[PDB]
Every structure is written in structure tokens, then in C-alpha cells.
Amino acid sequence: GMMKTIELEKEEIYCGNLLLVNKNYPLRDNNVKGLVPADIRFPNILMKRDVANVLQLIFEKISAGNSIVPVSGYRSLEEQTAIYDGSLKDNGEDFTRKYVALPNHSEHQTGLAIDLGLNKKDIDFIRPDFPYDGICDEFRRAAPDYGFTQRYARDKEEITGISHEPWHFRYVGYPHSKIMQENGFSLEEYTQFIKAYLEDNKYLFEQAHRAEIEIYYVPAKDDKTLIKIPENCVYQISGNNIDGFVVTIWR
Ligand SMILES: [Cl-]
Ligand SMILES: [Zn+2]
């Protein structure tokens, strides 16, 4: 059918589900919209609306009931700064650099990241309990089917700059989360990987109808970046927070 041109300003590389935010690549757009409470039972834990909806789908699918609680979701700049400086004081500099993201380098400031914990009264905010057994592990194994990935694995510490965290999950959206799982990728790795697939060489994701999904990378131009899309497709576009765009096409 008809194709459609999308025109993107360079600053849109700093918006979207696939932002890479880490020590090297800071958040450059503090302007998160569509934050809502993740759950009636925790009004102070906010996250992006579609991400709260997805988190509810996962808890329903695994029958989590009340055994998993959200410990931290969206954090503003002032919250992250207070957490970092308070951890300097309580825990020391080595621990804090390994476990608390720098202000403006925290995925929590995007509304796409969530810290989860077993439901106890004894919950450590910085280290909540989220083991690789039982219901927490059911979540962990279901998560990539729904757009979530465990962000900081032990075998990727040298790449992520952050120590192993059982409890921290990041929404990137489907099928990206599933492709990362199949390949054992951290987000750092996936952000490089997808650059190998340009518009004339798209990555093809397909399960078993369902539907075919194509994904490709578009480098950002200095000014306006031009992307073509079929009117005959649901699509998503995200910046990668560095240098370009990932386009996802549902065929
Ligand atoms: Cl066109
Ligand atoms: Zn976290």
C-alpha cells in the first residue's frame, strides 16, 4: 500500500522505550510524560502508563497476588541525588558507585525501570530480596515475553558498569526483550547489535502467528532524520539515547 514519511528532529534520539542510559550516556530529556501509579496498593510508585499496564499483565499471568511488591519505580532527579548521597554516607563510595546509578544516569528517571522485592516488612530499599526461586523467578522468566529484561546481570558487570542486581527490571518493549533473552544480551549489547540491521537489511522476528515483526536501525542526521513507514503497519520508533533510531514494524 501507501508508504508514509516520518520526519524526526535530532533531539528525539533522547526519547523512547530503547534509550540506553548508563555511565557513558546520560538522560538528556527529563520530561517524562504519562506517569501513573503502578498499582492502587502502592500510590507512591509511578511508572510510564503502558509499562504499569504490562507489569499488571505479568503479575496476573504468574498469579503473583501480593507476594511481589514494587519497591522503586520512577525517581526524579532530586530523589536519585538524595539516594546517591545518602548511600555515600551509609554504605561508602565503592558500594555506591557499584549499586546506585549517578544522578541523570539512572534508568529510574525514565519511568521504564522498576525495582521489585518479595513482600516483607524487612525490605531493603537499595537491595530488595528478589531470588532466583519461586514467584520472583516466575516473573523473571515471564518478563521477556512482555517487554521486560533483568537489566544488570553478573556476567555483564564490566559492560554495564553496575554490579549484579537480581531485583532491577527494565522495560524495552516486545520483541526487543525477547531478542535480548534469546541472545543473552544486556541493553548495551543490544544497542550495538541492532546497528547491524539497517533499512535495506532488517532484522526479522517471528514466532508462530502471532505476526512477523521487522526491526532496523536509522542513524540520526544532524538536523531532520527522514524515515519511511508503510501506512499498512502498526509501528513504533524510539531513540537509543546516543546516535539514532530503532524502528519496529508489525507486519
Ligand atoms: Cl513515503
Ligand atoms: Zn533499580
Coordinates of N, CA, C and O in Angstrom, one line a residue, residues 168-242:
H168 N 16.2 -5.6 39.7 CA 16.0 -4.4 38.8 C 15.7 -4.8 37.4 O 16.5 -5.4 36.7
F169 N 14.5 -4.4 37.0 CA 14.0 -4.8 35.6 C 13.7 -3.6 34.8 O 13.3 -2.5 35.3
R170 N 14.0 -3.7 33.5 CA 13.8 -2.5 32.6 C 12.9 -2.9 31.5 O 13.0 -3.9 30.9
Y171 N 11.9 -2.0 31.2 CA 11.0 -2.2 30.0 C 11.7 -1.7 28.8 O 12.1 -0.5 28.8
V172 N 11.8 -2.5 27.8 CA 12.3 -2.1 26.5 C 11.2 -2.3 25.4 O 11.3 -1.8 24.3
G173 N 10.2 -3.1 25.8 CA 9.1 -3.4 24.8 C 9.4 -4.8 24.1 O 10.5 -5.2 23.9
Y174 N 8.3 -5.4 23.7 CA 8.4 -6.6 22.9 C 8.5 -6.2 21.4 O 7.9 -5.2 21.0
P175 N 9.3 -6.9 20.6 CA 10.0 -8.2 20.8 C 11.5 -8.0 21.3 O 12.2 -9.0 21.5
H176 N 11.9 -6.8 21.5 CA 13.3 -6.4 21.9 C 13.7 -7.2 23.1 O 14.8 -7.8 23.1
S177 N 12.8 -7.3 24.1 CA 13.2 -8.0 25.3 C 13.4 -9.5 25.0 O 14.2 -10.2 25.7
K178 N 12.6 -10.0 24.1 CA 12.7 -11.5 23.7 C 14.0 -11.8 22.9 O 14.7 -12.8 23.1
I179 N 14.3 -10.8 22.0 CA 15.6 -11.0 21.2 C 16.8 -10.9 22.1 O 17.8 -11.7 22.0
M180 N 16.7 -10.0 23.1 CA 17.8 -9.9 24.1 C 18.0 -11.2 24.9 O 19.1 -11.6 25.2
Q181 N 16.9 -11.8 25.3 CA 16.9 -13.0 26.1 C 17.5 -14.2 25.2 O 18.3 -15.0 25.8
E182 N 17.1 -14.3 24.0 CA 17.5 -15.4 23.1 C 19.0 -15.3 22.9 O 19.7 -16.3 22.7
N183 N 19.5 -14.1 23.0 CA 21.0 -13.9 22.7 C 21.9 -13.7 23.9 O 23.1 -13.6 23.8
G184 N 21.2 -13.7 25.1 CA 21.9 -13.3 26.3 C 22.5 -11.9 26.3 O 23.6 -11.6 26.8
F185 N 21.7 -10.9 25.7 CA 22.3 -9.6 25.6 C 21.9 -8.7 26.8 O 20.7 -8.7 27.2
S186 N 22.8 -7.9 27.3 CA 22.5 -6.7 28.1 C 22.0 -5.7 27.1 O 22.1 -5.8 25.9
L187 N 21.4 -4.6 27.6 CA 20.9 -3.5 26.8 C 22.1 -2.9 26.0 O 21.9 -2.5 24.8
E188 N 23.3 -2.7 26.6 CA 24.5 -2.2 26.0 C 24.7 -3.0 24.7 O 25.0 -2.5 23.6
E189 N 24.7 -4.4 24.9 CA 25.0 -5.2 23.7 C 23.9 -5.1 22.6 O 24.2 -5.1 21.4
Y190 N 22.6 -5.0 23.0 CA 21.5 -4.9 22.0 C 21.6 -3.6 21.3 O 21.3 -3.6 20.1
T191 N 21.9 -2.5 22.0 CA 22.1 -1.2 21.3 C 23.1 -1.3 20.2 O 22.9 -0.7 19.0
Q192 N 24.3 -1.9 20.4 CA 25.3 -2.2 19.3 C 24.8 -3.2 18.3 O 24.9 -3.0 17.1
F193 N 24.2 -4.3 18.8 CA 23.8 -5.4 17.8 C 22.8 -4.9 16.7 O 23.0 -5.2 15.5
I194 N 21.8 -4.1 17.1 CA 20.8 -3.7 16.1 C 21.3 -2.7 15.1 O 20.7 -2.6 14.0
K195 N 22.4 -2.1 15.4 CA 23.1 -1.3 14.3 C 23.5 -2.1 13.1 O 23.7 -1.5 12.0
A196 N 23.6 -3.4 13.2 CA 24.0 -4.2 12.1 C 22.9 -4.4 11.1 O 23.1 -4.9 9.9
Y197 N 21.7 -4.0 11.5 CA 20.4 -4.2 10.6 C 19.9 -2.8 10.2 O 19.2 -2.2 11.0
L198 N 20.2 -2.4 9.0 CA 19.7 -1.1 8.5 C 18.4 -1.4 7.7 O 17.9 -2.5 7.7
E199 N 17.8 -0.3 7.2 CA 16.5 -0.4 6.5 C 16.6 -1.4 5.3 O 15.5 -2.0 4.9
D200 N 17.7 -1.6 4.6 CA 17.8 -2.5 3.5 C 18.2 -3.9 3.9 O 18.4 -4.7 3.1
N201 N 18.3 -4.0 5.2 CA 18.8 -5.3 5.8 C 18.1 -5.5 7.2 O 18.9 -5.6 8.2
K202 N 16.8 -5.5 7.2 CA 16.1 -5.5 8.5 C 16.3 -6.8 9.3 O 16.5 -7.9 8.7
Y203 N 16.2 -6.7 10.6 CA 16.1 -7.9 11.4 C 14.7 -8.4 11.4 O 13.7 -7.6 11.5
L204 N 14.5 -9.7 11.3 CA 13.2 -10.3 11.2 C 13.0 -11.1 12.5 O 13.7 -12.1 12.7
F205 N 11.9 -10.7 13.2 CA 11.5 -11.5 14.4 C 10.1 -12.1 14.1 O 9.2 -11.4 13.7
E206 N 10.0 -13.4 14.3 CA 8.7 -14.1 14.1 C 8.6 -15.3 15.0 O 9.6 -16.0 15.3
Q207 N 7.4 -15.5 15.6 CA 7.3 -16.6 16.4 C 6.5 -17.7 15.7 O 7.1 -18.7 15.1
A208 N 5.2 -17.6 15.7 CA 4.2 -18.6 15.2 C 2.9 -17.8 15.3 O 2.4 -17.7 16.5
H209 N 2.4 -17.4 14.2 CA 1.2 -16.4 14.2 C 0.3 -16.4 15.4 O -0.3 -17.4 15.7
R210 N 0.2 -15.3 16.2 CA 1.1 -14.1 16.1 C 1.3 -13.3 14.8 O 0.3 -13.1 14.0
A211 N 2.5 -12.8 14.6 CA 2.8 -11.9 13.5 C 4.3 -11.7 13.3 O 5.1 -11.9 14.2
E212 N 4.7 -11.4 12.0 CA 6.0 -11.0 11.7 C 6.3 -9.6 12.1 O 5.6 -8.7 11.9
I213 N 7.5 -9.4 12.7 CA 7.9 -8.1 13.2 C 9.3 -7.8 12.6 O 10.2 -8.7 12.6
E214 N 9.5 -6.6 12.0 CA 10.8 -6.3 11.5 C 11.4 -5.1 12.3 O 10.6 -4.2 12.7
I215 N 12.7 -5.1 12.5 CA 13.3 -4.1 13.3 C 14.6 -3.6 12.6 O 15.3 -4.4 12.0
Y216 N 14.8 -2.3 12.6 CA 16.0 -1.8 12.0 C 16.5 -0.5 12.6 O 15.7 0.1 13.3
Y217 N 17.8 -0.2 12.4 CA 18.4 1.0 13.0 C 18.5 2.1 11.9 O 18.7 1.8 10.7
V218 N 18.3 3.3 12.3 CA 18.4 4.5 11.4 C 19.4 5.5 12.2 O 19.0 6.0 13.2
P219 N 20.5 5.8 11.6 CA 21.4 6.8 12.2 C 20.8 8.2 12.1 O 20.1 8.5 11.1
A220 N 20.9 9.0 13.2 CA 20.3 10.4 13.2 C 21.1 11.3 12.3 O 22.3 11.3 12.4
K221 N 20.4 12.1 11.5 CA 21.1 13.2 10.8 C 21.3 14.3 11.7 O 20.7 14.4 12.8
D222 N 22.1 15.3 11.3 CA 22.4 16.4 12.1 C 21.2 17.2 12.4 O 21.1 17.9 13.5
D223 N 20.2 17.2 11.5 CA 19.1 18.1 11.6 C 17.8 17.3 11.7 O 17.4 16.9 12.8
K224 N 17.1 17.1 10.5 CA 15.9 16.2 10.4 C 16.4 14.8 9.9 O 17.1 14.8 8.9
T225 N 15.9 13.8 10.5 CA 16.1 12.4 10.0 C 14.8 12.0 9.4 O 13.7 12.2 9.9
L226 N 14.9 11.4 8.2 CA 13.7 11.0 7.4 C 13.5 9.5 7.5 O 14.5 8.8 7.1
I227 N 12.4 9.0 7.9 CA 12.1 7.5 8.0 C 10.9 7.2 7.1 O 9.9 8.0 7.2
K228 N 10.9 6.2 6.3 CA 9.7 5.8 5.7 C 9.0 4.5 6.3 O 9.7 3.6 6.7
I229 N 7.7 4.6 6.4 CA 6.9 3.6 7.0 C 5.7 3.2 6.1 O 5.2 4.1 5.5
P230 N 5.3 2.0 6.1 CA 4.0 1.6 5.5 C 2.8 2.1 6.3 O 2.7 1.8 7.5
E231 N 1.9 2.8 5.7 CA 0.6 3.1 6.2 C -0.1 1.8 6.7 O -0.9 1.7 7.6
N232 N 0.1 0.7 5.9 CA -0.3 -0.7 6.2 C 0.5 -1.4 7.4 O 0.8 -2.6 7.3
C233 N 0.9 -0.7 8.4 CA 1.5 -1.3 9.5 C 1.5 -0.6 10.9 O 1.5 0.7 10.9
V234 N 1.3 -1.3 12.0 CA 1.5 -0.7 13.3 C 3.0 -0.6 13.4 O 3.8 -1.5 13.1
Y235 N 3.5 0.6 13.8 CA 4.9 0.8 14.1 C 5.2 1.5 15.4 O 4.3 2.2 15.9
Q236 N 6.5 1.4 15.8 CA 7.0 2.2 17.0 C 8.4 2.7 16.5 O 9.1 2.0 15.8
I237 N 8.7 3.9 17.1 CA 10.1 4.4 16.8 C 10.6 4.8 18.2 O 9.8 5.3 19.0
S238 N 11.9 4.6 18.5 CA 12.5 5.0 19.7 C 13.9 5.5 19.4 O 14.5 5.0 18.4
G239 N 14.4 6.5 20.2 CA 15.8 6.9 20.1 C 16.6 5.8 20.9 O 16.0 5.0 21.7
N240 N 17.9 5.8 20.7 CA 18.7 4.9 21.5 C 19.5 5.7 22.5 O 20.4 5.1 23.2
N241 N 19.3 7.0 22.6 CA 19.9 7.9 23.6 C 21.4 8.3 23.2 O 22.1 9.0 24.0
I242 N 21.8 7.8 22.0 CA 23.2 8.0 21.6 C 23.3 8.7 20.2 O 23.9 9.8 20.1

